[PDB]
Amino acid sequence: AQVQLVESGGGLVQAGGSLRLSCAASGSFFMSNVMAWYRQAPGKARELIAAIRGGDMSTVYDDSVKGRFTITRDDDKNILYLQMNDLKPEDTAMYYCKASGSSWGQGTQVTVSS
Amino acid sequence: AQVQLVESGGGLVQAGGSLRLSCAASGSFFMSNVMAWYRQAPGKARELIAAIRGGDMSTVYDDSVKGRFTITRDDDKNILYLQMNDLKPEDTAMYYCKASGSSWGQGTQVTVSS
């Protein structure tokens, strides 16, 4: 859908650890009302966990990740980031990026061991 | 998940028309960082379209619905609403409500005819 998102990052980390996800866009997307990261656990619905609101640049985080995850965006490189800190086994899921009008990032796996 | 959401509303409407969706919670949820409505078209991923950010009460809308849809919340009744105006065939989808820490609303169908 117009702007394409190439997702990278993820892997396997111990609880308490950190991982960063990246989402490189094919063009500018700072004009999107919503620039977000979504989480989908195995038998669960996909759900938004972090977003930048296109315009005032304010952020929103779901209670489950607030204070541990941080969403940022670099308009020089046209990259949206998700810095995950203090990871927990419950954060194990496929992660997707999406912006208003853009296509979805391909899902990445994040696995958090005991 | 702690607070339960009972979804109601939807139906069939002509393009240009209006419908309201409601989501009655089992308890207070104004403390949720995210109070939102999500859209899932038949062969597509679920996606957030409108949210109230728990705290400052500011809103965010995906570009696809901004200026046509409005999200509101009544803390006396503990109901989250989505007022949909100027409906288009492309808005045809299953709609779900969700708040941080709450369970998902059961999906409702909204069908917009020619």
Interface contact flag, B63 A33, Cβ < 8 Å: yes
- The residues that bridge with A43 in the sheet, in sequence order, are none
For chain B, say whether A51 makes contact (Cβ under 8 Å). yes
Cβ of residue A46 closer than 8 Å to a chain B Cβ: yes
Distance from CA of B43 to the nearest CA of A (A): 14
The minimum CA-CA distance between A100 and chain B, rounded to whole Å, is 6
Q: Which domains does chain B have, with CATH numbers?
A: 1-114 (2.60.40.10)
Tell me B29's DSSP state: -
Radius of gyration of chain A (CA): 13
Count of Cβ atoms closer than 10 Å to residue A65 Cβ: 22
A107 Cβ neighbours under 8 A, 6+ residues apart: A7, A40, A94, A95, A96
- Residue B1's alpha-carbon distances to A39, A60, B102, in angstroms, are 17, 21, 5
**Method by which this entry was solved:** X-ray
**B105 within 8 A of B23, measured Cβ to Cβ:** yes
Strand blocks (E) in A1-114: 5-9, 11-14, 19-25, 34-40, 47-53, 59-61, 69-74, 79-84, 93-99, 108-113
Contacts of A101 in chain B (CB under 8 A): 63-64
Cβ-Cβ contacts under 8 Å, A50 against chain B: none
Interface contact flag, A60 B34, Cβ < 8 Å: yes
- Distance, in Å, from the CA atom of B73 to the CA atom of A31, rounded to the nearest integer, reads 27
User: Is-contact A108 A9, C-beta < 8 A?
Assistant: yes
Q: Which tokens belong to A102?
A: 């853009």
Between chains, do B58 and A53 touch, taking CB under 8 Å as contact? yes
